[PDB]
């Protein structure tokens, strides 16, 4: 499609419109500022919060029809989708609330989502690697301590913003 | 990213908001229906023109910043684009008018570019395939009125809506 869906800006808000039953909202809070700063660590896009007004990148909790094309379809088959850059409903990323959100690995991982949610809403489409954050699956680990950005997240990811200098 | 993204009703609306200068307007509405029924004939979708309201298809031909995430730049480099099925921007098609549309092939045929737009209207890619009516690169072709989908775009549709009822 005519352009790579990508910031022209470096500097980025967001806003947590609601939060999950599935966690108490400081986890949230935390899934949501650790998903963002595996692209400000690789990367010069900056994030700030917004607790009011139309942000970029807003963030949200839904189940079944929500309000855009794609409703949810209950526990399985789809558990966020985001969308990629540009205004309105652009660079938003939903949860479906009827998976089980997760500090763990219990089942579903909020960070690990919503980290993959970002690539999207950042400008990342998914990976073919079996190892790579934009993989189409989700797959939990055992140790969310050994967790990276696989290199094939790195440079899609850069190949879009740079390395971090600040641009 | 992830989801289906077609259109889940058959029965798909459009409108031309406005015309080129470079060519008469019942130039520009026929090359518009031929661009609608080469894909009617190849799946079972129907179109119906609206000459007010808001419409699946907003067809409208532009130039520089123009209301969406992708000003048009000027003539040459790109000619038009348009966005995969769902709500508002989604569906529309738009046409830069820095370059100059025609009849035949002296310049950028309105029908094929119309002809591949509507495709990504109805939720095909580009294509790799190097005949095929989404390719990304243009190519002017006469004969026009006795123009054909390839088997790589057919494919591309019926993917997403079939074979037209139709035996
Ligand atoms: C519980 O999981 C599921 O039921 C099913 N669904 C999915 O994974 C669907 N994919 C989706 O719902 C969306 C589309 S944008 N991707 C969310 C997602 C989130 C995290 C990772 C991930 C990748 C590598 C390491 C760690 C985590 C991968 C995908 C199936 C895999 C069976
Ligand atoms: C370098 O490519 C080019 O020369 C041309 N530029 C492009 O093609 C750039 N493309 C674009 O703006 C859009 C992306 S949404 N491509 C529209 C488009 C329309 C019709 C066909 C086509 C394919 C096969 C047979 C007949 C026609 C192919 C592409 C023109 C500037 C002359
Ligand atoms: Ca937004
Ligand atoms: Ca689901
Ligand atoms: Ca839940
Ligand atoms: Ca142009
Ligand atoms: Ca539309
Ligand atoms: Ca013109
Ligand atoms: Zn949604
Ligand atoms: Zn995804
Ligand atoms: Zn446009
Ligand atoms: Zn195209």
Known sequence: FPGIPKWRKTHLTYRIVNY???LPKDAVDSAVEKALKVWEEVTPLTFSRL?????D?????????????????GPG???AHAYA???????????????????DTTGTNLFLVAAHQIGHSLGLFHSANTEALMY????????????????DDINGIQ?????????
Chains 1, 2 share one sequence.
């Open 20 to 22: 999950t039953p599935d």
């Open 51 to 55: 607790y009011e007004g139309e942000a």
């Open 57 to 73: 990148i807003m963030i949200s909790f839904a189940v079944r029809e929500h309000g855009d094309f794609y409703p949810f379809d």
């Open 77 to 79: 088959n789809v558990l």
């Open 85 to 103: 850059p540009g205004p309105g409903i652009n660079g938003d990323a939903h949860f479906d609330d009827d998976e089980q959100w997760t500090k």
């Open 136 to 151: 189409p699956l989700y797959h939990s680990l055992t140790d969310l301590t050994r967790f990276r950005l696989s290199q």
């Open 159 to 167: 190949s879009l913003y740079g390395p971090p200098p600040d641009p």
